[PDB]
Amino acid sequence: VNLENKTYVIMGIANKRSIAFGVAKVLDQLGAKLVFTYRKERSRKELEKLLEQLNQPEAHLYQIDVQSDEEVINGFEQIGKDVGNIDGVYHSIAFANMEDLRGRFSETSREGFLLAQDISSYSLTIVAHEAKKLMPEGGSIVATTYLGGEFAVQNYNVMGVAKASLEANVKYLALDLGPDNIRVNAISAGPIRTLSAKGVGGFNTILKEIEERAPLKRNVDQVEVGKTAAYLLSDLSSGVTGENIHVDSGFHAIK
Amino acid sequence: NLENKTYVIMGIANKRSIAFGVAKVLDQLGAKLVFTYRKERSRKELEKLLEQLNQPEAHLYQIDVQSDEEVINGFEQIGKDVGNIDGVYHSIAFANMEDLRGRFSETSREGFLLAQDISSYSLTIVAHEAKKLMPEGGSIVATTYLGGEFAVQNYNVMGVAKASLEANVKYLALDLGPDNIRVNAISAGPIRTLSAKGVGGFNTILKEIEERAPLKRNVDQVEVGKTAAYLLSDLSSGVTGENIHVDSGFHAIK
Amino acid sequence: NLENKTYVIMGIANKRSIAFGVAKVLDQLGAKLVFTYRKERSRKELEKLLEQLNQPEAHLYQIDVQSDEEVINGFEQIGKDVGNIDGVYHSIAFANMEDLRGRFSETSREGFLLAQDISSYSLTIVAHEAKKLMPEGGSIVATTYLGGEFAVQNYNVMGVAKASLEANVKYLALDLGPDNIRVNAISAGPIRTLSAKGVGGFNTILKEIEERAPLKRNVDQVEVGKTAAYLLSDLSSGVTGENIHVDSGFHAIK
Amino acid sequence: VNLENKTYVIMGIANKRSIAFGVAKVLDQLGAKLVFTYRKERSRKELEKLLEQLNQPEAHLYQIDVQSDEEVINGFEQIGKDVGNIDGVYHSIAFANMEDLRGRFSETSREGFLLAQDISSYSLTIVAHEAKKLMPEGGSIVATTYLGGEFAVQNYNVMGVAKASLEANVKYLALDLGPDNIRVNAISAGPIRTLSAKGVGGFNTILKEIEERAPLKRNVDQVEVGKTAAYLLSDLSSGVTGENIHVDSGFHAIK
Ligand SMILES: NC(=O)c1ccc[n+]([C@@H]2O[C@H](COP(=O)([O-])OP(=O)(O)OC[C@H]3O[C@@H](n4cnc5c(N)ncnc54)[C@H](OP(=O)(O)O)[C@@H]3O)[C@@H](O)[C@H]2O)c1
Ligand SMILES: NC(=O)c1ccc[n+]([C@@H]2O[C@H](COP(=O)([O-])OP(=O)(O)OC[C@H]3O[C@@H](n4cnc5c(N)ncnc54)[C@H](OP(=O)(O)O)[C@@H]3O)[C@@H](O)[C@H]2O)c1
Ligand SMILES: NC(=O)c1ccc[n+]([C@@H]2O[C@H](COP(=O)([O-])OP(=O)(O)OC[C@H]3O[C@@H](n4cnc5c(N)ncnc54)[C@H](OP(=O)(O)O)[C@@H]3O)[C@@H](O)[C@H]2O)c1
Ligand SMILES: NC(=O)c1ccc[n+]([C@@H]2O[C@H](COP(=O)([O-])OP(=O)(O)OC[C@H]3O[C@@H](n4cnc5c(N)ncnc54)[C@H](OP(=O)(O)O)[C@@H]3O)[C@@H](O)[C@H]2O)c1
Ligand SMILES: CCCCCCc1ccc(Oc2ccccc2N)c(O)c1
Ligand SMILES: CCCCCCc1ccc(Oc2ccccc2N)c(O)c1
Ligand SMILES: CCCCCCc1ccc(Oc2ccccc2N)c(O)c1
Ligand SMILES: CCCCCCc1ccc(Oc2ccccc2N)c(O)c1
Ligand SMILES: N[C@@H](CCC(=O)O)C(=O)O
Ligand SMILES: N[C@@H](CCC(=O)O)C(=O)O
Ligand SMILES: N[C@@H](CCC(=O)O)C(=O)O
Ligand SMILES: N[C@@H](CCC(=O)O)C(=O)O
Ligand SMILES: N[C@@H](CCC(=O)O)C(=O)O
Edge to edge, the sheet with strand C60-62 lists C60-62, C32-37, C6-10, C87-90, C138-144, C181-188, C243-246
Phi, psi dihedral angles at C55 (to 5 degrees)? -65, 120
Beta-strand pair D88-91/D139-145: parallel
Give yes or no for B246 touching C (CB within 8 A): yes
In terms of phi and psi (left: phi > 0; alpha: psi -120 to 50; beta: otherwise), the region of A73 is alpha
| Residue D98 CA to ligand 12 centre (angstroms) | 10
Beta bridge partners of B182: B139
What CA–CA distance (Å, rounded) separates A149 from D16? 42
Task: Check chain B for breaks (C–N over 2.5 Å) and list the residue before each, or none.
Answer: none
**Which of D161, D170, D244 is the mutation pick for testing C, counting most C CBs within 10 A?**
D161
Neighbouring residues of D164: CB distance < 8 A, sequence distance ≥ 6: C163, C164, C166, C167, D149, D150
What CA–CA distance (Å, rounded) separates B253 from A226? 35
Amino acid at C197: K
* Residue of C150, A175, C241, A164 whose CA lies nearest to D244: C150
| Residue A116 CA to ligand 9 centre (angstroms) | 20
* Domains of chain B: residue spans and CATH: 1-254 (3.40.50.720)
- Residues of D annotated as catalytic (active site), given as ranges: 146, 156
A10 with A36: CB under 8 angstroms? Answer: yes
Phi, psi dihedral angles at D254 (to 5 degrees)? -130, 165
DSSP A7-75: EEEEE---STT-HHHHHHHHHHHTT-EEEEEESSHHHHHHHHHHGGGS--SS--EEE--TT-HHHHHHH
Return the number of other C-beta atoms located less than 10 Å from residue A143's C-beta. 29
C126 with C90: CB under 8 angstroms? Answer: yes
What CA–CA distance (Å, rounded) separates D11 from D37? 5
DSSP D27-96: HHHTT-EEEEEESSHHHHHHHHHHGGGS--SS--EEE--TT-HHHHHHHHHHHHHHH---SEEEE-----
Do C160 and D165 lie within an 8 Å CB cutoff? yes
The protein residue with its alpha carbon nearest to ligand 2, atom 11, reads B91
DSSP B30-43: T-EEEEEESSHHHH
What CA–CA distance (Å, rounded) separates A114 from C133? 54
| Residue C11 CA to ligand 3 centre (angstroms) | 6
Q: Residue D147: its chain B contacts at CB < 8 A? A: 254
The protein residue with its alpha carbon nearest to ligand 3, atom 3, reads C190
Rg (CA), chain A: 17
- Residues of C annotated as catalytic (active site), given as ranges: 145, 155
Neighbouring residues of D34: CB distance < 8 A, sequence distance ≥ 6: D7, D8, D9, D10, D24, D27, D28, D54, D56, D60
DSSP B87-155: EEEE------GGGGSS-GGG--HHHHHHHHIIIIIHHHHHHHHHGGG-TT-EEEEEEE-GGGTSB-TTT
What CA–CA distance (Å, rounded) separates D115 from B158? 44
B145 is catalytic: yes
* Best mutation site among C98, C101, C158 for ligand 11 pocket (most ligand atoms within 8 Å of CB): C101
Q: Residue C151: its chain A contacts at CB < 8 A? A: 215, 253-255
Return the number of other C-beta atoms located less than 10 Å from residue C211's C-beta. 7
> Could you say which of D217, D227, D246 has the minimum Cβ distance to residue A238?
D227
Mark B132-158 as b/e (b = at least 16 C-beta within 10 Å): ebbeebbbbbbbbbbbbbbbbbbbbbb
The protein residue with its alpha carbon nearest to ligand 2, atom 36, reads B11
Task: Indicate the resolution in Å.
Answer: 2.2
Going by the DSSP 8-state scheme, the letter that residue B233 receives in this structure is S
Element (H, E) at B245: strand B243-246
What CA–CA distance (Å, rounded) separates A61 from A48? 9
What CA–CA distance (Å, rounded) separates B109 from C174? 40
Say how far residue A63 (Cα) sits from the centre of its chain. Answer: 16
What CA–CA distance (Å, rounded) separates C178 from D176? 41
* Residue of A28, A149, A135 whose CA lies nearest to A89: A135
* Residue of C101, C112, C90, C118 whose CA lies nearest to C198: C101
What CA–CA distance (Å, rounded) separates C44 from A244? 52
Method by which this entry was solved: X-ray
Mark D116-132 as b/e (b = at least 16 C-beta within 10 Å): bbbbbbbbbbbbbbbbb
Write down which chains contact chain D via at least 3 CB pairs under 8 A: A, B, C
* Residue of D190, D196, D91 whose CA lies nearest to D144: D91
Do A245 and D243 lie within an 8 Å CB cutoff? yes
Return the number of other C-beta atoms located less than 10 Å from residue D82's C-beta. 11
Mark A157-176 as b/e (b = at least 16 C-beta within 10 Å): bbbbbbbbbbbbbbbbbbbb
Element (H, E) at A116: helix A110-117
Edge to edge, the sheet with strand D61-63 lists D61-63, D33-38, D7-11, D88-91, D139-145, D182-189, D244-247
- Largest Cα–Cα separation, chain B: 50
Write down which chains contact chain C via at least 3 CB pairs under 8 A: A, B, D
B7 is catalytic: no
What CA–CA distance (Å, rounded) separates B92 from B42? 13
